[PDB]
Amino acid sequence: SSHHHHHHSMPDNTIQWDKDADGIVTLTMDDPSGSTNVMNEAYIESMGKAVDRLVAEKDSITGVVVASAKKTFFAGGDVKTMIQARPEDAGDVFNTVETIKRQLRTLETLGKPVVAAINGAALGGGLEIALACHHRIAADVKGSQLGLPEVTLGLLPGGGGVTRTVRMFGIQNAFVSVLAQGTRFKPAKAKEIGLVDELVATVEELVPAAKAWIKEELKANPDGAGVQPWDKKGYKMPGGTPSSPGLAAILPSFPSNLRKQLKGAPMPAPRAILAAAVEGAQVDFDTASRIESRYFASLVTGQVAKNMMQAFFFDLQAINAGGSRPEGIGKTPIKRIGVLGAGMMGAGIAYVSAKAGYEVVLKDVSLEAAAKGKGYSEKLEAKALERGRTTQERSDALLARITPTADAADFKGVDFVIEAVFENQELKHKVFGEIEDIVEPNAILGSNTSTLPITGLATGVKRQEDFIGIHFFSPVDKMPLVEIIKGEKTSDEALARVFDYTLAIGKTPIVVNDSRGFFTSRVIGTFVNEALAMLGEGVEPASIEQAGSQAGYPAPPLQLSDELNLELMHKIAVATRKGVEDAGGTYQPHPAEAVVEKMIELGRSGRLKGAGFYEYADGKRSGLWPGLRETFKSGSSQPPLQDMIDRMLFAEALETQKCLDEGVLTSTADANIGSIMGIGFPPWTGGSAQFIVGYSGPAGTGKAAFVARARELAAAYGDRFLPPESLLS
Amino acid sequence: SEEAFIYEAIRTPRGKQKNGSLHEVKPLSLVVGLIDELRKRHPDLDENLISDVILGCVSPVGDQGGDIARAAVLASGMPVTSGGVQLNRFCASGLEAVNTAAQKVRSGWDDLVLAGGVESMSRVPMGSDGGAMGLDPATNYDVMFVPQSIGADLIATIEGFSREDVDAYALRSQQKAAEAWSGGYFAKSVVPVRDQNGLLILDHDEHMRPDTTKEGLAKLKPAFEGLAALGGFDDVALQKYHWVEKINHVHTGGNSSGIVDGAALVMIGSAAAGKLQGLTPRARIVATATSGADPVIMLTGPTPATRKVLDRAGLTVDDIDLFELNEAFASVVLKFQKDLNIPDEKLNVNGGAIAMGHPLGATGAMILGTMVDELERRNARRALITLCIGGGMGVATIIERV
Amino acid sequence: SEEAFIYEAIRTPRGKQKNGSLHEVKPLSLVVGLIDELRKRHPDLDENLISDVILGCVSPVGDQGGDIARAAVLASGMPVTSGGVQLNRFCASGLEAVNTAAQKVRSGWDDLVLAGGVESMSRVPMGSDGGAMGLDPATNYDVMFVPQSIGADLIATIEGFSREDVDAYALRSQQKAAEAWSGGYFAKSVVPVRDQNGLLILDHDEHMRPDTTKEGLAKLKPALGGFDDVALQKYHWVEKINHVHTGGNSSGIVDGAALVMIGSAAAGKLQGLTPRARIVATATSGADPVIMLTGPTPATRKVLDRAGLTVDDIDLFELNEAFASVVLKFQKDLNIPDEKLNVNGGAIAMGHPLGATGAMILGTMVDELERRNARRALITLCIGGGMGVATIIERV
Ligand SMILES: Cc1cc(NS(=O)(=O)c2ccc(N)cc2)no1
Ligand SMILES: Cc1cc(NS(=O)(=O)c2ccc(N)cc2)no1
Ligand SMILES: Cc1cc(NS(=O)(=O)c2ccc(N)cc2)no1
C-alpha cells in the first residue's frame, strides 16, 4: 500500500506545486515529454510525490485544486505501453492501476475539498482524475470533450471510472450513458448528466472559481467538506443495488439486452464493464475498486484490445497524420462543389459537403430529379430538428448551399467535381465531356465508381491529371470513409486535394492504386459470395445471417446482398469472366455466381426490385423468403457455426493480403481502417490485415495459427482458402 | 436394496395468486396442517421412528427460510430427533424430496421419512432468492440465461405447435381437472386449509377456470408480464439456435402453469417400517432417473429422464398405465407426447398445473400423490411421473400400485 | 449392496470476515474453482458419468440463491445431465450432501456424484434468508428460539466448564491447526483461490491467530433480548447462565467451499479412479432446541450401533468446533481420548463456513487417516434447531 510504483531501488516530474496563504494547493499537471498530459509512468510518480506531500502537510492545507497547463486537460493514457502487456504481465498491470487508484482514493478521502479545473479535453484517465475530485468546473471552451472512451480501444475505465460512475448514477445509467459505448460529451451535456457541476466562460476563471468554491464549501458545509456521497453513512445508490427488489427485477435483462445489441459478437469489453459494474455495487468502494482492476487486467492482456488499440489508435494516427497523403504538397482551398447525379449517392455527397460549409450545385437529368435529390438533405434536417441536434438558424443555411439544377451551365465556378452517375464507362465520358469546359480549369474531377478503373475513365477528359476516384459509401451521411483511387495518369496534387477534402467533411481517407475492384468493393465481394455459396451448398439462411452477425458485421450478408443489388453482382462476374477469356484463358467461376443467376431467374434480385433474399413490404424489410429453403435445399448441409463465421472472415482477410501483395494497398493501416470504416469489417478484429497477425483460434494465436485455420478451411471447402506465399516460409 | 413404499400422500388445495384464499396463511402453517392430518389418520403412530422430514422449496426466503422443514418439525411438536432439511432443484423439488426420501430408505440408514414440498407464491414470489444465473452478468453470459417462457415458445416453434394447438391442450386440462373434482377423485387427498379456530379457508383448487372455451383462450395475449417483457432473450436464444428465424410466441397465461400457493406431504418407508406402525402400503417406488437437456430450451428434460427410468426398471412405454407430466407449459407436454408416442388417454388424465396451479416446490409431490390415488381408482398397476426443470434438467419416477 | 467410496475431497482456504481476501470473490466462482481442480487431477474423467452435484448452503440468497449447485454445473461447462441440487440442514449441510450422495450411490440410481457446500459469510451474512423459526412471533414462542451462543454457555454452566476451560480448548485448537499447516498436512487438499488472470487471492486460512496466548484469550469479552430468561424458563433448575464464550473460543465466520467426489466401486473402476475411503454408515439425531448443541452425542452413538463399533474402534474423532463447550461436552460424554479429537485444528482456528464446513472436515479426516495409515474416523457436527449428524469413514 504505497502511492509509488516501486518499493525497491528515475523519471521526470509532470506536476507543479503551489500553496497559498489560505492553504489551497494548486496541482498543475504539465508533462514536458509531450503536449498532452497522459497517464504514463511519469505521471504516476509525479502524482505519487504530490499525494504524499498532501498528507505530510495536511495540517497546513485546507483544499486542493487540480489544473492543467496544456490546451487539453488530461487525454488518455500510455497506449504504447499497454499494447505490449503479455499474459505474464498481468501481475504488473493489476498493481499499476491499483497504485493509480490508491493515489486518487487518498486525494478523495482527505478531509479537504478537491476541485478539478477542467480547462479542456478530459478523456479517459483524465476524467477519472476529475471524478476523484469532490467538485468539477469545466471551461465551456471550443473543442473540450469529457468521457471515458476506454471501451473503444478494447479496455475499460480502470482508474476508478467504472466504480465511481456507478456510485454517481447507478448500474443502469452509468453503463448505458457513459461506460458501455464510451461516448464523448460536450461541456454543456457533461454538466447536464452529472459529470460536471459548474461551467465558466474562459479558462482564466477556473482556478479562481475553484478556490472560491473551496472557501464557500468550508464555510457553509464544514462537516461534509471533502466527503463524497458514497463515503457518508446514508449512501443510497441511485437505481438501487443488486440486492434491491426494483433493480433485481430488471437486472437479469442487462446481459441479454447487451447480447441483443452486440449480436453475439466476441467483444469482451462491454461484457466485462457490465460485470465490474454489478459486482462493484455489491461490495464497498475499495473492494469494488479492486474488482475493477482484475477485469481491466483481463482485457489488457487479451487479444481484442491489442487489435482495437492497433487500429483505432496507431493505425488511425498514421492516416490522420498524412501517412497516405502525398508528401511535399500545399493546400488548395475549395470554393464550390458540383455533384453529378442526384441519386442516393449524389444526394448523400451533397449533404456531407454542404454540412461542412461548402457551396454545392446538385445537377441531374431534370429539375424534378435534382430537387428531389436535395430532398434527401431536407428530410434529414427535419430529423435533426425533432431530436434537437441542430438549430433552425444553422439548418436553413445548410440547405441554402445546395442549388439543385438541370442546366449544365450552372456548374460555372465549380473547382471540385464529384460524379455519382450510373456505373457505365461511356456514360461517364459523356457526363464529364458535357461539363469539363464549363468548370474552372484546375478543378478536381472525381468519380464515385465502384469497379471501373480510373485509368480508363480518365480517357474521357482533356486533363487526365486532375481526374481521380473519390469513392463514397451509402448512406454517405453516416459512412465515415472515402476510398481515394489513384489512376495511372493521376497526379500527386489531386491525391492531396481529395485527401484534404475528406478531412474537411469529417471522414477518413485511404489511398489505393488503380485496380479492378479497388479494395473496398473487391474485398466485400468475397464476403457476400461466401454466404451465397454457403446458401447454394444447402446451409440454412437463418444460420448464414446469424453467423454473419455473430462475426461482428453491422449487417448480415444476405441482407447486404439485397442492398448491393444482385444484377450488378452479375455484371461484375461477367466483366471478370470477360477479362480472363479476353486474355485467352480459362475462367474459374465462383460457386456464388450460380446462386446470383438463380435469383435473377426468379425475379428476386434485391431490394431495388421489391424482392430479394428477404421479403419487402411497406418500405421496411419483412423476413427471409419462404421459397428460399425449397429452392436451395436448405438444411441438407449443417456445418459448424464457427466454420460459417471463419469462411466469411478468412475470405476477406486472404483477399486483403492479395491487395497488399498486388500493390493495391500501400500500408497495413489503410487495410485495417479501410476495411472497418469502409466495408464494415468487425472492429474486434482490428482490421482485415490485423485479423491475420492477431488471429486467436482454438489451435493457437498469431500468423502461424491463421495459416493453420486457413488450411483447415482449404481442405474442407475449396482451394480459395489457401494462404498466399506472402504468409508462408 | 430395501424397497421404499408410499404409505400416505396428501396435499392442500392450491390458492390463486391475486386475491387468493391462502394469501393470509403462512407457508409453515400449510405444512403443519398436513402434519396434523397424518396424526388424524394414524393417532397411534410412534413419530419417534420418523427420522427425517424433507421438503422442497425453490424460494427459501422470508417465510420459507431457515430450514422450513425443521420449523415444521418443531412447531408441530414432532419428536426433536425427526431432523428436517430443505432442497431446491427448481420445478422438481417436490419429487426430488420423495426420490431422496426413497433413496434414504434404500440405503437402510433411514426407515420412516416424510417428504414433500411447500411454496406460497402469493407471499414469496419466484426469484426472491436471487441467484448468480440471473443477477451476475458474467454468469448470465456463459449460461445463456433465457426464462422458461421463451424456451416454451421455442419448442412450439421447432416442433410446429400452433397457437390453437397449445390452447387446445389448455382446454383439455381444464376439462379433465373439473371432471376429477366433480367426480370426487380428489375428495380424500386434498386436505382443506383451516385456521387456528377450525374455520374453513380453502377446500378447492381456486385457480381452475372450468367453463373455459376455445374462443376465450384465443383472446389472451402472449406472455409479457415478467422478465420476458424486457427484451433480448429472444435474440440470445436464437444465437444458439441459429437455424431458427423467428420464435412464435404462443404461450399466454391460459396455456401456462398457474401461480398458486400449496403444499404436499408424502410418507415413505420400508416394508418393515410400515409393519411396525401398522401402515398399509399404497405404492412402491420402482425407480428414479435424472437427466438434463440444453439450458436454452431448458424444458425438453422430461424426454431423456423418462427413458432412463424405463431402462432401469426394464420397462417400455407400453408398460406404463398413467403418465403425469407437470403442465408447466403446453408445448412441454405436446413435445413429450409427440416424442415418446404417449397415448392421449394416459397423459395427465386428471388435469394439471395449467388448470390447478404449479406451487414450484410442492408440485412434484402433489402430482405424485395424484397418481397414487388414480392407480387405485382405475385399479391400474404402473404410473410414471416426470417434470421439466429450470436450467435444463429432468426428473422421472415410476411407481407401482400395491 | 453398493458401497460408497470417496475418491476426491478438496476444499478452498477460509478467508476471514473483516477485510477478508475472499470478500471480493463470489461464492459461485469458489465452487467452479474446485471443479477445475478435479478436472486437473483427472483430465480423462468422463464428466457425463457424473449424475448429480449436491451442495449445502444455509443462506441461499443473493449470490447463493437460485440453486447455486446448478449454476456451478453450467458455469463450469459440465454436462447438462449432471444435475445440480442445493440443500440446507443448518451447520451440517456440508456433511448432509455427502451422506445423501453416498445414499444415492447405495440405492443404485446414481453412479458418480459430487457433494460439498459453499458459504460466503462476508457477502451473504448468516440469517440473510430470514426464517419463520426466528422472525415469526408465533413460531419464535413455540420452538423457544435462542441463539446458539447461549445454548453453548448453558452447556458450560451445567457441565461446569469454566472460562479458562473453554479458552484452554481454544488455545489447543490454534496450536494443532498451525502444526498441521507447518507439517504440510493441508498441502494437497487446500486449493488456493485465484482470480480470472491467475493472480493469487488466498492460499491459507486467514482467521488463524497461531500466536494465541492464554492471557490474551482471557482479555476477550462475551444480545438484545431475554434469551437468557427464555432459556432458563425451560432449564428451571439452573439459576444463572455463565457466559464463557467469546470470539476466541467460538467458531470463526469465514468464506469458503469444499467438494467431495463420491461413487461406487464400478464407477471408479470404469473411470480409472482409486478409492481413498469408504462411507461406513450415517445417522441423524437431535436434541431439544434450547440447548441445541447436544446433537453430536446421540447421533454419534446411533452411527456406532449401525456399524457395530465402539469408541475404542474409531481412530479419529472430528467434531465441528462451533463452540468450545460443545466439544468438551461431547468429549466428556463418550470419554473421547484427548489425542483423537480434532487433531489437525478446528473451526475456532480456521473457521466455520456453515454450508461448507461438514465437507471440509470430512476431507480433512480422509487425509489424516491416510497420513497416519489409520483405519476409521467419525465426523459429527452440532446443528442449529437441535439436530445432530454423524458419519463413519474407513480408509481404503
Ligand atoms: C459497405 C460497402 C461498400 C460497398 N462497395 S460498392 O461499390 O457499393 C459495391 C457494389 C457492388 C458489389 N458487388 C460490391 C460492392 N458496398 O458496401
Ligand atoms: C429471473 C429468473 C429466475 C429463474 N429461475 S428458473 O426458471 O429456475 C431458471 C434457472 C436457470 C436458467 N438458466 C433459467 C431459468 N428464471 O428466471
Ligand atoms: C439470526 C439467526 C439465524 C439462526 N439460525 S440457527 O442458529 O440455525 C437456529 C435455528 C433454529 C433455532 N430454534 C435457533 C437457532 N439463529 O439466529
Residue numbers in the entry:
A (entry chain A): -13 to -5, 1 to 720
B (entry chain D): 2 to 403
C (entry chain C): 2 to 223, 230 to 403
Tell me what the authors wrote about this structure, in their words.
The Mycobacterium tuberculosis trifunctional enzyme (MtTFE) is an α2β2 tetrameric enzyme in which the α-chain harbors the 2E-enoyl-CoA hydratase (ECH) and 3S-hydroxyacyl-CoA dehydrogenase (HAD) active sites, and the β-chain provides the 3-ketoacyl-CoA thiolase (KAT) active site. Linear, medium-chain and long-chain 2E-enoyl-CoA molecules are the preferred substrates of MtTFE. Mtb is capable of switching its metabolic preference during the latent stage of infection in order to utilize host-derived fatty acids as a source of carbon rather than glucose or glycerol.
The six fragments that bind in the substrate-binding pocket are B-E1, M-1, M-53, M-76, M-83 and M-109. Fragments B-E1 and M-83 form hydrogen bonds either to Serα512 or to both Serα441 and Serα512, both of which point into the catalytic site. These fragments also make weak interactions with the side chain of the catalytic Hisα462. The five-membered ring of fragment B-E1 points away from the acyl-tail binding tunnel towards the KAT225 loop of the thiolase β-subunit (contacting the Leuβ228 side chain) and the H9A helix of the α-subunit (in particular Proα243). Leuβ228 and Proα243 line the groove between the I2 site and the K2 site.
